[PDB]
Design a protein around this ligand. Structure first.
Ligand SMILES: O=C(NCc1ccccc1)c1ccc2c(ccn2Cc2ccc(Cl)c(F)c2)c1
Lengths: 270, 11
């Protein structure tokens, strides 16, 4: 039993390494100044944003700079572009979770929809400290303060993610822990519209056992870590709910915003 | 047409 659980943990960690280019290990190395690489460009204000701005990954008809006169909208679009690529990464990872691709294809789609926002905020915590967030594949750092200074509605956009990240990072998970945690989140059987719930629940049961074992071995002195982590899954759901509410506000007030069709598919009836 | 489905069916 336990041998298979360990094998499952290792399978998931290897797949995680293949799917996600910027890991927590790499991010923490950068954030702690423990890398040989040139340290990130810091965007803490409007002037540093000009310089740094061309560092944001955005690929479109015109450069990011020309998208809006409003800085908050350009940052918004940057987050959106990253989000699309993050969904692609999570999809590849999900395909590596044993049993997932054998589920009803429509159930695979449903799991990814509801799941991808929760996973994005989990991993986002890997890129954060209490003062800001790594951007552009770790080549940039945007301060929490600067993000908070954006005009409403956009000023409160990132703050709940930072709050979650502070608590979540206090758990000191590493990438092997996270690989299983994320797999657990994807395989939630209570997602709306799931056709076959039981097979999904079966896989999640197995993943949850693997996670429990992983946390006991990797964090022997952290008591009830498993319990604390499960409660975080529920927290993430609340984060997403509030994010969607803000997005609806933005949609009503600002027509200068445009959603990528992939994100539109994800947000529809969600 | 689902773009998620498109990504899932990618190689
Ligand atoms: O809420 C999110 N996605 C959901 C979403 C947002 C916008 C439009 C439609 C859907 C979200 C927010 C922040 C994110 C990510 C991934 C990384 N960061 C950090 C970050 C910070 C600053 C910049 Cl400029 C950047 F490019 C990236 C995802």
């Amino acid at each position: 039993e336990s041998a298979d659980l360990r094998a499952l943990a290792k399978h998931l960690y290897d797949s995680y390494i293949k799917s996600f280019p910027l890991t927590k290990a790499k991010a923490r190395a950068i954030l702690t100044g423990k890398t040989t690489d040139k340290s990130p460009f810091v965007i803490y204000d409007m002037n540093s944003l000009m310089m740094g701005e061309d560092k944001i990954k955005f690929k479109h008809i015109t450069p990011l700079q020309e998208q809006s006169k409003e800085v908050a909208i350009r940052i918004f679009q940057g987050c959106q572009f990253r989000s699309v690529e993050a969904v692609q990464e999570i999809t590849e990872y999900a395909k590596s979770i044993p049993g997932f691709v054998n589920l009803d294809l429509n159930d695979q789609v449903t799991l990814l929809k509801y799941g991808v926002h929760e996973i994005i905020y989990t991993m986002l915590a890997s890129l954060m400290n209490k003062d800001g967030v790594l951007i552009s594949e770790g080549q940039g750092f945007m301060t929490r303060e600067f993000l908070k200074s954006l005009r409403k509605p956009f000023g409160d956009f990132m703050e709940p993610k930072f709050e979650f990240a502070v608590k979540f990072n206090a758990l000191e998970l590493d990438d092997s822990d996270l690989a299983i945690f994320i797999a657990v989140i994807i395989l939630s059987g209570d997602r709306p519209g799931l056709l076959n719930v039981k097979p999904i629940e079966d896989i999640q049961d197995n993943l949850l056992q693997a996670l429990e074992l992983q946390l006991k071995l990797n964090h022997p002195e952290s008591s009830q870590l498993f319990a604390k982590l499960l409660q975080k899954m529920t927290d993430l759901r609340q984060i997403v709910t509030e994010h969607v509410q803000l997005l609806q506000v933005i949609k009503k007030t600002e027509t200068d915003m445009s959603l990528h069709p992939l994100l539109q598919e994800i947000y529809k009836d969600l | 047409p689902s773009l998620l489905k498109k990504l899932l069916l990618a190689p």
